Amino acid sequence: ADIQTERAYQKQPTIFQNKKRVLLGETGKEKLPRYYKNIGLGFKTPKEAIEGTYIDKKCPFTGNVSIRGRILSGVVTKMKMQRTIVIRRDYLHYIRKYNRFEKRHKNMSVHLSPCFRDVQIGDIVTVGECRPLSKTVRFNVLKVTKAAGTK
């Protein structure tokens, strides 16, 4: 109902949901078994991913992606695209001649899974590298930590 919003049927490819059963087991509950995996590197699977019902092939926990490479951090700056946000990474570049530094920044478009909700602008996000998901997206959100002003 709410999940089915596209012209094509949204399904989890590795789950077979047409297994026939007796009439007694049909009355109990129509609860599809969820597919999820541990991504490794000490990151825990959010409870909303295990208990959720969303369909996302690019989700690091319930989708077909692999996390390998560099693990980076950023601050959420824009949330206006579908399932992907823009974060900003700030740093200092050293100039040898003057023995000083200058402030520089980069912008990253990263994929945000539906399992992460209540994400606001200005909170810290830990992302991991994966295969290119689109023209400009190469990283996926792995952890979200709130800002210092959380009450």
Partner: peptide, 11 residues
């Protein structure tokens, strides 16, 4: 003479 004034000085 700030520590982060390299851009200003170079420019």
């Amino acid at each position: 003479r700030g520590l982060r004034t390299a851009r200003k000085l170079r420019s």
